[PDB]
Amino acid sequence: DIPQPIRGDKGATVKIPRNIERDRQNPDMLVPPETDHGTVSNMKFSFSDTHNRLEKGGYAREVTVRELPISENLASVNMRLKPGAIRELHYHKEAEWAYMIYGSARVTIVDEKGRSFIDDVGEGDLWYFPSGLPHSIQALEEGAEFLLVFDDGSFSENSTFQLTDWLAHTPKEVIAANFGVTKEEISNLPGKEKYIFENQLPGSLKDDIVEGPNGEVPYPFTYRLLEQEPIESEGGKVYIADSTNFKVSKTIASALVTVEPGAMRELHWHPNTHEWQYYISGKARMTVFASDGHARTFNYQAGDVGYVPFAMGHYVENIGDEPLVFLEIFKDDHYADVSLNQWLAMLPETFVQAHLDLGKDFTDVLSKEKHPVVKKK
Amino acid sequence: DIPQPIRGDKGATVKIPRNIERDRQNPDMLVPPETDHGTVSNMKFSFSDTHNRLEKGGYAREVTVRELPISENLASVNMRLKPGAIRELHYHKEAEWAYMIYGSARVTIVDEKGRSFIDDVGEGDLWYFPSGLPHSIQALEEGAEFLLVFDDGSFSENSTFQLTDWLAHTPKEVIAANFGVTKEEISNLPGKEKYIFENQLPGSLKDDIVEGPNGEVPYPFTYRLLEQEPIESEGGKVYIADSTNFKVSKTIASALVTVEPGAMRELHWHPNTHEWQYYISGKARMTVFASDGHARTFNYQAGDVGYVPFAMGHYVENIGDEPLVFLEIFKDDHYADVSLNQWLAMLPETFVQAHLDLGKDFTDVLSKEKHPVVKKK
Amino acid sequence: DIPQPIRGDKGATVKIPRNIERDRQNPDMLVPPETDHGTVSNMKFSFSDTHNRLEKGGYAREVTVRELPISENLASVNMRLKPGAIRELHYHKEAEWAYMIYGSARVTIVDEKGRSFIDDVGEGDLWYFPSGLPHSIQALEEGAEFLLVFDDGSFSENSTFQLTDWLAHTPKEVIAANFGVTKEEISNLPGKEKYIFENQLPGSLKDDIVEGPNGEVPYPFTYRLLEQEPIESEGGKVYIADSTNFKVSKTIASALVTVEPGAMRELHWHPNTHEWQYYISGKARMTVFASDGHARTFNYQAGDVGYVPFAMGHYVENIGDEPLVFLEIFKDDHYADVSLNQWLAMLPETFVQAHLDLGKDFTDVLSKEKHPVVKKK
Amino acid sequence: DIPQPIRGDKGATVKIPRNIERDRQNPDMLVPPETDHGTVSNMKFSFSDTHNRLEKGGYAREVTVRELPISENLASVNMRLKPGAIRELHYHKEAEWAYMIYGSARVTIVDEKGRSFIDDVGEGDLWYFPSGLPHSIQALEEGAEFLLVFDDGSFSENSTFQLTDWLAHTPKEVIAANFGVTKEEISNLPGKEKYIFENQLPGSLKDDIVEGPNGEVPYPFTYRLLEQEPIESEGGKVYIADSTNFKVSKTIASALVTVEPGAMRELHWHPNTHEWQYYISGKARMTVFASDGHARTFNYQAGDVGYVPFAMGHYVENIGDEPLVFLEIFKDDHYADVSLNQWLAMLPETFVQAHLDLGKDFTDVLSKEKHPVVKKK
Amino acid sequence: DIPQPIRGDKGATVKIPRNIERDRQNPDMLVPPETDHGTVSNMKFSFSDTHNRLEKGGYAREVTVRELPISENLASVNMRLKPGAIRELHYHKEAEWAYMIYGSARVTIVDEKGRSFIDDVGEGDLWYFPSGLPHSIQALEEGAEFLLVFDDGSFSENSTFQLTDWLAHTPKEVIAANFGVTKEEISNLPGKEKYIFENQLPGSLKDDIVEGPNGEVPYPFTYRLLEQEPIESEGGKVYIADSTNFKVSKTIASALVTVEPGAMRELHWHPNTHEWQYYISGKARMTVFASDGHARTFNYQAGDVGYVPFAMGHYVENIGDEPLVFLEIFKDDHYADVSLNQWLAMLPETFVQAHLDLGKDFTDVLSKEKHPVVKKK
Ligand SMILES: [Cl-]
Ligand SMILES: [Cl-]
Ligand SMILES: [Cl-]
Ligand SMILES: [Cl-]
Ligand SMILES: [Cl-]
Ligand SMILES: [Cl-]
Ligand SMILES: [Cl-]
Ligand SMILES: [Cl-]
Ligand SMILES: [Cl-]
Ligand SMILES: [Cl-]
Ligand SMILES: [Mn+2]
Ligand SMILES: [Mn+2]
Ligand SMILES: [Mn+2]
Ligand SMILES: [Mn+2]
Ligand SMILES: [Mn+2]
Ligand SMILES: [Mn+2]
Ligand SMILES: [Mn+2]
Ligand SMILES: [Mn+2]
Ligand SMILES: [Mn+2]
Ligand SMILES: [Mn+2]
Ligand code: NA
Ligand code: NA
Ligand code: NA
Ligand code: NA
Ligand code: NA
């Protein structure tokens, strides 16, 4: 039950003190496929290996370019809110995309024309807040836990502007002049940020809707991803949300992938941009093919972030007994992939045979229809 | 009448030789608000602190990233022309935006389809010359003084291509072949650039219009900013020109702001890009809130450049007895701001109260209409 | 037995699928000290989270700037050799430092004057190979497992030049001319690299010494670290090797630290350069103080790499029941530290009291002698 | 009395609102020499244009690469302390050099061998604290005001580690273990930094000297610059301190220059590194010659920072009625200059004549002795 | 006689218009060795492919990082002077090293203590001018042509400060004050640089020596390379000059290599830094081995610059009927190489046999003495 880095006549037993628990989580890294080769950047990081900021009302932990340097364009926060607790009104330079994993929450956003959008989001729903637009989150009666993705990997403390922090660092006489009140009237303003704070549960959504002289926002900032019809194939399902259906989501394209036991996200690549991954549940392995005979295999499980640099070939195999559920995230205005199977199926069979040194028995199995998740025979 | 860096029981008298004239211009820097905190980049530079290039016909001085390093994307020239004097036919890699502060001038531009645009510009008018399109300026009978803004902060001698400089560094036999003339016919070409040169006043605009086989340009390269209806609020006026109304101005969005004595440009931020400022007249202070409890206050007066990095919160207060007039410049295709007041006004009042630890007496003063310049009570 | 990110009235239970095994390894990251604050880069990475290259004869895995981006100046390989197995003759652009954790090995090196050094290294011994000098490793009868440290964090496949790889990519006619032999005489050269390969155990060291016309090397390339007298203090021992005693080790300074249960490497910083850490055995926590009120705590155990950026304050506490053993590595020609205790002990007591708002009862405990590892009372 | 940017038939009157006070301070920038040409970076910045941090006990303001981007390698703080006030025990990644302009202070420093140095510094004295060594400043009965120079232009809040800040962000149980005390015994530690704080005047220096088991420091960390014999020439004096006489000052070389009215620091350049300048008193102009026909003239007065990039030719002329006093600072282990006069004096006269198209009447005035400050005839 | 890119059954005839003259110069690039592989940067550039600056008195052309981007640290000028012509008094930020290929010249230099050095240099002699020290060159009765090497690859117009250019961009009143003369006395100064200018031949060297009050320079700035005893081996000679024998040459190490027909500079690498090459005469090929199975072969002839990045393996084979003469240049304080032959000769023979899969017949030919240039059998 003690694994060793041995493959046939290659490798040897570990002779120094070691981390057996981590080795058991990484079987394809302690003993990689013999087809791996060459230097490839790290493509895997666990939220469990990050500092958790604890507050009255919840917590937040992040995986950024300071943890996973291959991911320069995207960063992520795992945030948790207790029932009624508020993530303080704030904004960022980055656009923010979110997936609700557990529970439910009410969000607010106001746009640059002064129009307000207030909505409740449940498990499987998304939101997207464009760069610089101010927003808040308040958990409902079950609390909430969700994944935030920001479209800059350097996301840091310097990215986020909190309402009470701004006011605490503005001269009181200027605040008073701004609103037409006296300094005495604003003397009870907080002296520092709140960030996350406890609060009574709100009332019904309909009671919170604020009417305004500038009308309704043209497009909603939330999306019910799991209410859409997925792409179904023999081994699982894919739900896609990008700017073509979730109209406001102009800089983030996303897919939720479910892979049954014994199934795999097929060999494919993305012709548009890098892939950022979050593993919601289950256990996987992925080989990233990096060109020029370079390839490296990684293991993932719940709580891990993954990455596939622009156009590298890859697959995602379920290596456990439970369903594998993960997100594919892209900094682009649409989702796009090329399927290895479909590519070859759409070429003259003798041309494919000339490449692969295989016969009609192989080209006969190719499918001109794309099946993103396939089931083992 | 000698100011000292003392605020209550903090600070002390200056004991070394000092610049009292500059200290008097910078009262909120010698004695900042107690709400300032932390390292913030310099956001202020005076044209009076720059080298002035003097020529027969006028002068030019510039504030670039070599003077104000926070402004990497935008640079500016203050240029002056005597009556009739010509800024030599030239082009740049950068797009050029201009505001006519004093006097009037005739501009020419030819586009990449060979279409010509010639127009007169007066006080309060703009022009915008897209990258690489060749142009000239000639002052009319009052002379002219104007502000140029270029959409690269590294604007330098290497950005600008002058007609006579190009010809002076082209083999004479090639020039002759290009035009179908002899070398003798071009022997009087200048041996070096002119840049700015004296000239007789031109005739009437209508006599200068050149008709061509390629027709008129589809959109004009000048704009009468001060002839537009401004946004009026209790303390001043805002005139906006961006690509939605000044159609050719695709990379520069602008606003001219006037703030009466006792008034202020309200607390706001820009959700799209950095703000570059030029102070035409009057005296101001601005606090820039940089997130994570960082804030710094700056003083400005006529001839100063200011800056607000992308999405930082700010206000601009008139601290003098005369109107304050300044420009807000953005490298983007539209102007956008979020008002702190309007943001909070469009949220449920009890939610705002929970954030600010203030009551209904405060939320009752919030306005759902945006008022960019407010008047002190 | 299921840990939760809860500290008093802060934090909450985890509601999404999670990595409980990693959470148990990182108790001070799931529940940090309340004294932590602010954004700090990741300072921790496990060799168990890396791809292991398996060969006939052993294995090698690496932690580089592609895994741990804060460590730009230093990278490391964990290498294992079976009895008699050879790490092929090679050289690198980087200098190489090594610590023998398990077993023993014979090394060779030849310098730029053609002088050879051949020696056996056992547990607790070091070697240092200057940049560009060619070397080899061959394990003896117990095999060997050791830590290599290279003085560039970007250490990659492109850093290392193998004997047989060079020859395989040199025209055969040039090799033949170089050595004065025929192409037929070199026809059996390998067609690709070996890297690590199995081999019979060598004979006695004395039989391998090669005499040469250029004499002996002036300084040895191996060092018996654990044969030196350590600095002993109440809670452990420190063995230092830098260029002042291990003369050739000009770019790497090192210390082996042992910390008994209930003891800690005291609060200190390094005034010369960054610290790179490898945890040989045991379990630790460290808080890195990053200035300006920023601090973050990390957990470490056997197989982990740590890091402390230049001059940040830190301590290393044993949080387990077994001894804690780790290496402190520095890219410099000497080891240097400043002790917080010794610093304060060497100042006037009333001056220290004025800083700390503590009395003579505190300054009486300060020690003017440096004790690098202290024991809890 | 209103200056205009007019030189003969070049330039014109200013027609827009302007800063006449700054124009009067910058006569050679409003009206440059006709020999100036081309793009040259800004080489001038005033401490009066910076934010002043006010505390109980004094103030501090800084000029860094964020203000003066040409100065990437050096930054400076103007710091003021009231009588008895303390600049809190701290250290930096950067080396620190200082010149005492007004008053006097006591400094402490402890080195990496635990040796203490405590000394009083008066007007005209220097100190130098090597990178990472911890130190403090306490003003004596006159207070103190001084110039600090740090050998990295990016000097920021993140450069400096304060004693009480470190302790406030260290777990109390770790502090207690570090010193062998209880948590109750350290319960009164400050919760945040002090930075600068008021304190009673100290006793006599001799009473503060702390004896230690590690002996005295080998070289002193203070230097009496104005007690040295200066280089005297017809128009002023130069006092040099570099690592050849102020032995510890390995990364900063300095000169204090005094220039009488009607005198000038002669035409020269530095063959080793960039020059950073601080103007203590008086009024100057300097032309920087940047090669390839580029040159720009700058004005300076008390409180200004100047700069001369590596090897650019320059002079510093007194343009006022009082003595001109300034510092020349270099990030190097020695001071070096080449004098234009001495250079030409040491060449064959007919060779110099062939270059300059001048005769023996000119070469007869050249001097083979270097005179750094010359007096007008 | 028309070469084609065909090697056995690989390659094909060229079907498009082509440069047959260049193909004939590059036989090992049109048809590389089959042992070449992979992407390798360009390592070859011809002075004949550069712009030649022509002046009255000579010419100058350069190969810099703008031509050969792999060479970031070193750049070179081929300069020619007619009899008596002068390269104008000047200095640079870079150190300058030179090899006299044709003719002879007189150089001057003055150091930072005002000491002068004047000397004549002939064919095969060197000079080295440290950074920032001012110098001149004047050809004697045969004229001169020489190679300059500067220790920054970005060497450009902005690197060099000319005497008359500096004076032309300094206010006349400042020049007059600097020297104690009137403006009328300097009215005939040149209005622009000379750079290279014609002049009468100088007198005898002894008549030019300028005596000074500061004594003689401690070390000479010229070196007679070809008067030294070379390393001789069967196929050629190597003359080395670095800071250990040419004492002032602290940043440039050099070797002049002569390779007879049928000989080769042996397989070796440099453990210290990059190699920069200039081919004085003859024809060569070199394969650069770049690690990880990458290698590329280049052709060189008179007038070419070559390069070998730090530690890459290489050889230089004479592929013509005349001697091959080239320079090896290094930015370091010493020359160092490792010989492949000597390396293997200094190891146990059975250990080498185990690596190469060759027998005693091969290890018997290895030599423990280094022979830098070997002759084919
Ligand atoms: Cl206030
Ligand atoms: Cl409402
Ligand atoms: Cl011509
Ligand atoms: Cl016409
Ligand atoms: Cl061959
Ligand atoms: Cl032997
Ligand atoms: Cl505690
Ligand atoms: Cl004591
Ligand atoms: Cl003059
Ligand atoms: Cl003489
Ligand atoms: Mn957010
Ligand atoms: Mn994918
Ligand atoms: Mn223009
Ligand atoms: Mn604004
Ligand atoms: Mn090695
Ligand atoms: Mn340490
Ligand atoms: Mn300090
Ligand atoms: Mn100087
Ligand atoms: Mn030169
Ligand atoms: Mn070589
Ligand atoms: Na990073
Ligand atoms: Na800059
Ligand atoms: Na990296
Ligand atoms: Na800067
Ligand atoms: Na280049």
Numbering used by the authors:
A (entry chain A), B (entry chain A), C (entry chain A), D (entry chain A), E (entry chain A): 6 to 382
From the study:
Of interest, the single W→Y mutants (W96Y and W274Y) have predicted hopping rates approximately the same as in the WT simulations, confirming our premise that replacing tryptophan with tyrosine will have little effect on the overall electron hopping rates, assuming that a proton acceptor is available to establish a neutral tyrosyl radical as the hopping intermediate. X-ray crystallography was carried out on single crystals of the W96F and W96Y forms to determine the structure of the W mutant proteins. W96F and W96Y mutants share the wildtype tertiary structure. The average distance of the aromatic planes within each dimer differed only marginally by ∼ 0.1 Å or less. X-ray crystallography was used to confirm that the quaternary structure was not significantly disturbed by the mutations.
A single protein subunit contains two Mn-binding cupin domains, and catalysis depends on Mn(III) at the N-terminal site. A π-stacked tryptophan pair (W96/W274) links two neighboring protein subunits together, thus reducing the Mn-to-Mn distance from 25.9 Å (intrasubunit) to 21.5 Å (intersubunit).
